[PDB]
């Protein structure tokens, strides 16, 4: 059962943040109400671990968490509803009012990784894979299915909204990533399909397999 999500950020480690489309309206409303409240209560003592508001590069305020105070000019924040990080001065920080807390609406961005694929260890190969995914899915609406948990973030399959093509499988087909085998019996059909695409990618001498195997 695939659910619609909006992909916000792709990380250099081939993880990615998504927002649930079903709650997009609620996020929009919260932001509208938060900003109306900020406009009347113009910007707090930033400290590590604390929630705040932070003024992004579009000139708008968003919900954030303080991760590191490097100096008064360099406060490291994480935008809880989008997943991007930013270093900013104190002039771009404010109090997050209780009316807009994560109890009122949960953090809207969730970190995921692709199921059944290995993130390339070679730096340039990993860049090629990241770059593909950025071009194809960053800031677009996709379909998502949670496959399995891990000692880390959950792993998922994504589908393109239009073609319904499996995104991670696309990477394997292109020879941009290798397959990550799992033992669960319910994953055997999909893993066999991924291994089949990988072998075909190897025979076509694409990307990772350009010079053979």
């Amino acid at each position: 059962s695939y659910k619609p999500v909006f992909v916000t950020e792709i990380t250099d480690d081939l993880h990615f943040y998504v927002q649930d489309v079903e709650t997009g309206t609620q996020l929009e409303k919260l932001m509208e109400n938060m900003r109306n409240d900020i406009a009347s209560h113009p910007p707090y003592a930033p400290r590590r671990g604390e929630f705040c508001i932070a003024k992004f590069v579009d000139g708008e305020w968003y919900r954030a968490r303080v991760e590191k105070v490097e100096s008064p000019a360099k406060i490291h924040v994480f935008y809880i509803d989008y997943g991007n990080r930013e270093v900013l001065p104190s002039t771009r920080l404010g109090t997050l009012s209780p009316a807009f807390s994560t109890r009122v609406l949960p953090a809207q961005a969730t970190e995921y990784a692709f199921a059944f694929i290995q993130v390339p260890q070679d730096d340039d190969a990993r860049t090629d894979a990241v770059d593909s995914v950025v071009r194809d899915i960053q800031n677009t609406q996709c379909l998502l299915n949670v496959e399995h948990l891990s000692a880390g973030c959950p792993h998922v399959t994504l589908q393109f909204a239009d073609s319904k093509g499996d995104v991670g499988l696309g990477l394997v087909k292109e020879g941009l990533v290798m397959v990550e085998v799992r033992k669960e019996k319910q994953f055997q059909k999909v893993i066999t399909e991924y291994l089949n695409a990988q072998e075909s990618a190897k025979s076509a001498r694409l990307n990772l397999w350009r010079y053979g195997d």
Partner: peptide, 6 residues
């Protein structure tokens, strides 16, 4: 506007 102008 989901891309935030980006």
């Amino acid at each position: 506007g989901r891309a935030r102008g980006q």
